[PDB]
From Swiss-Prot, chain A:
<keyword id="KW-0810">Translation regulation</keyword>
<dbReference type="GO" id="GO:0005829">
    <property type="term" value="C:cytosol"/>
</dbReference>
<dbReference type="GO" id="GO:0045948">
    <property type="term" value="P:positive regulation of translational initiation"/>
</dbReference>
<protein>
    <recommendedName>
        <fullName>Translation initiation factor eIF2B subunit alpha</fullName>
    </recommendedName>
</protein>
<dbReference type="GO" id="GO:0006413">
    <property type="term" value="P:translational initiation"/>
</dbReference>
<dbReference type="Pfam" id="PF01008">
    <property type="entry name" value="IF-2B"/>
</dbReference>
<dbReference type="GO" id="GO:0003743">
    <property type="term" value="F:translation initiation factor activity"/>
</dbReference>
<dbReference type="InterPro" id="IPR037171">
    <property type="entry name" value="NagB/RpiA_transferase-like"/>
</dbReference>
<dbReference type="GO" id="GO:1900036">
    <property type="term" value="P:positive regulation of cellular response to heat"/>
</dbReference>
Curated annotation (Swiss-Prot), chain B:
<feature type="compositionally biased region" description="Basic and acidic residues">
    <location>
        <begin position="253"/>
        <end position="263"/>
    </location>
</feature>
<comment type="subunit">
    <text>Component of the translation initiation factor 2B (eIF2B) complex which is a heterodecamer of two sets of five different subunits: alpha, beta, gamma, delta and epsilon. Subunits alpha, beta and delta comprise a regulatory subcomplex and subunits epsilon and gamma comprise a catalytic subcomplex. Within the complex, the hexameric regulatory complex resides at the center, with the two heterodimeric catalytic subcomplexes bound on opposite sides.</text>
</comment>
<comment type="similarity">
    <text>Belongs to the eIF-2B alpha/beta/delta subunits family.</text>
</comment>
<feature type="region of interest" description="Disordered">
    <location>
        <begin position="239"/>
        <end position="266"/>
    </location>
</feature>
<comment type="function">
    <text>Acts as a component of the translation initiation factor 2B (eIF2B) complex, which catalyzes the exchange of GDP for GTP on the eukaryotic initiation factor 2 (eIF2) complex gamma subunit. Its guanine nucleotide exchange factor activity is repressed when bound to eIF2 complex phosphorylated on the alpha subunit, thereby limiting the amount of methionyl-initiator methionine tRNA available to the ribosome and consequently global translation is repressed.</text>
</comment>
<protein>
    <recommendedName>
        <fullName>Translation initiation factor eIF2B subunit delta</fullName>
    </recommendedName>
</protein>
Length: 302, 266
């Protein structure tokens, strides 16, 4: 039946779906075919499927996290010590429901937790996240005065895309160079983030250049922030400043081989430390200081 | 000089002036006609005054002119007369927008006086106190600091919470710059607010705010009356080095990192 097929199914639309929410739904669908009463024929098989999915990955991180979340939910489900049927039914139900809840969470984020850009505080944003854009659009809707700042994305020309998505609203924006990042910290207020995953240590699993940005923020004491749909805590620990589970090579040292070729392999995933989160926008209420760690503890009961 | 010392400690500029006077005295021989002598001596003194002060000020102004952008928001502290003059010039002579912000402390009403003067000339002023500074910053674009004396370290020996302001500037967006006279520099050096402290009587905060001469009945006035109480203060503090990058004198351009580059040339 495949989760991979389901994943393939959604491509051009989305924007509304939220990472694991779709993956979780797919998993649920996979489950509700091959008898969800038994535990020996089921949990192990699910795990195997997840492993297969992991193996099959080109460049995607949060899937694992989603799977883990699903597993946790499943574990939580069977503790009532009554009957196998009701619990099974509940399990079957909880996928579409979960998806629905995601939308609610997004709505909450967009109406309640949007009081960080209000007094024309110029926002420094890089890394395309859907939640960020939702926040932007709903700020425009509320008329809550604002200005936008985006550093040019040029590994695969997502910058242009971002610019286009900003033209829909109809508000002036500017191009920024990521080497001349030290040149402009003057009028732009704070640095906000759209990323790929939330770390076990505390920092953020993000794209091409972030550590430098973080450093600059620290120098300027203009607080660093992360804007996300809050269920992307990937089971990964960045123990050092340059060591992680990565989709590609870590700063690939290439040999002088051909003419104008082996250089375009830019390190398109990078990390910054735990002592940077002044606030993180979470759908379970605005909670940050050591929240991710707490969540992890709650999950692994340690 | 001794009398002056007894009254209140003096500045480096004054010392320099004294030295110059001594040199002049050494120069003119006593065998010359007396009437003829001081006729020329006075002229020479006048010339010196014109050059090492007014001309220096002019030079400072011209430096500011080339450097300062098309209309600027300006922040200052104290009673830095040269800077006030420059501000006035900007307002009235060359004619540009002057959103000038002045900060002031409790013991001295220098800032207030400056503000008053600006008002009298017709300037839009923003008045500030100790409790907060950042309230106007978090907007503030270009800042000049209060000046008194410079050392051969690259540091500054200046008035009140200027150091705090400098620190704030360093933290938030942009560094600070100070313009001075070419005869302000010393060859003596220090690096803390414990080295040499400039003191007056602890009485500026005894009177409950408002005006200076009041004479009131209340509660304040316990220097020795109650069970052990001390009400001490400071006037001059240490301004830092890494933050005031700019220094402009009679030699036009340079950095405070070049702490005694002009001392050989003079």
């Amino acid at each position: 039946f495949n989760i991979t097929e389901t994943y393939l199914r959604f491509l051009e639309e989305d924007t509304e779906m939220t990472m694991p929410i779709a993956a979780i739904e797919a998993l649920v669908t996979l489950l509700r075919i091959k008898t969800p009463e038994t535990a020996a024929e089921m949990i192990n098989t699910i795990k195997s499927s997840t492993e297969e999915l992991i193996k099959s990955i080109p460049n995607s991180v949060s899937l694992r996290a989603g799977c883990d979340i699903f597993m946790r939910f499943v574990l939580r489900n069977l503790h009532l010590y009554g009957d196998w049927e009701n619990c099974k039914q509940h399990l079957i139900e909880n996928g579409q429901l979960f998806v629905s809840r995601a939308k609610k969470s997004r709505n909450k984020i967009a109406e309640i937790g949007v009081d960080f850009i209000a007094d024309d505080d110029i926002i420094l944003v890089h890394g395309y996240s859907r939640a960020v854009f939702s926040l932007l659009n709903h700020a425009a809707n509320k008329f809550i005065r604002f200005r936008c700042v985006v550093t040019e994305s040029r590994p695969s020309k997502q910058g242009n895309q971002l610019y286009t998505l900003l033209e829909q609203k109809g508000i002036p924006v500017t191009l920024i160079v990521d080497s001349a990042v030290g040149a402009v910290i003057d009028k732009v207020d704070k640095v906000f983030v759209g990323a790929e995953g939330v770390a076990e240590s505390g920092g953020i699993i993000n794209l091409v250049g972030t550590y430098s940005v973080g450093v600059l923020a620290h120098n300027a004491r203009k607080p660093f922030y992360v804007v996300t749909e809050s269920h992307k805590f990937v089971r990964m620990f960045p123990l050092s400043s340059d060591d992680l589970p990565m989709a590609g090579p870590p700063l690939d040292f290439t040999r002088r081989t051909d003419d104008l070729e082996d250089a375009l392999r830019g390190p398109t995933i990078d990390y910054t430390a735990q002592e940077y989160i002044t606030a993180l926008i979470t759908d379970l209420g605005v909670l940050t200081p050591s929240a991710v760690s707490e969540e992890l503890i709650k999950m692994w009961y340690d | 000089i001794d009398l002056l010392k007894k009254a209140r400690p003096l500045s480096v500029t004054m010392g320099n002036a004294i030295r110059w006077l001594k040199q002049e005295i050494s120069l003119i021989d006593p065998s010359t006609p007396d009437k003829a002598a001081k006729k020329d001596l006075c002229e020479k003194i006048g010339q010196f005054a014109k050059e090492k002060i007014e001309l220096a000020d002019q030079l400072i102004i011209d430096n500011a002119s080339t450097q300062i952008e098309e209309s600027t928001t300006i922040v200052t502290y104290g009673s830095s007369k040269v800077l006030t003059e420059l501000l006035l010039h900007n307002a009235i002579s060359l004619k540009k927008n002057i959103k000038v912000i002045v900060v002031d402390s409790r013991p001295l009403f220098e800032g207030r006086k400056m503000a008053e003067t600006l008002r009298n000339a017709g300037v839009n002023v923003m008045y500030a106190l100790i409790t907060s500074l950042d309230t106007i910053f978090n907007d503030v674009d270009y800042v000049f600091l209060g000046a008194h004396s410079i050392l051969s370290n690259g540091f500054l020996y200046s008035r009140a919470g200027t150091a705090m302001l400098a620190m704030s500037a360093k933290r938030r967006n942009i560094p600070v710059l100070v313009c001075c006279e070419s005869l302000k520099f010393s060859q003596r050096v220090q690096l803390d607010s414990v080295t040499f402290n400039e003191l007056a009587d602890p009485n500026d905060l005894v009177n409950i705010d408002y005006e200076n001469p009041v004479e009131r009945r209340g509660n304040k006035g316990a220097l020795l009356n109650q069970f052990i109480k001390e009400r001490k203060f400071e006037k001059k503090k240490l301004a830092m080095e890494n933050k005031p990058k700019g220094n402009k004198i009679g030699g036009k351009k340079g950095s405070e990192g070049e702490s005694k580059d002009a001392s050989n040339e003079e």
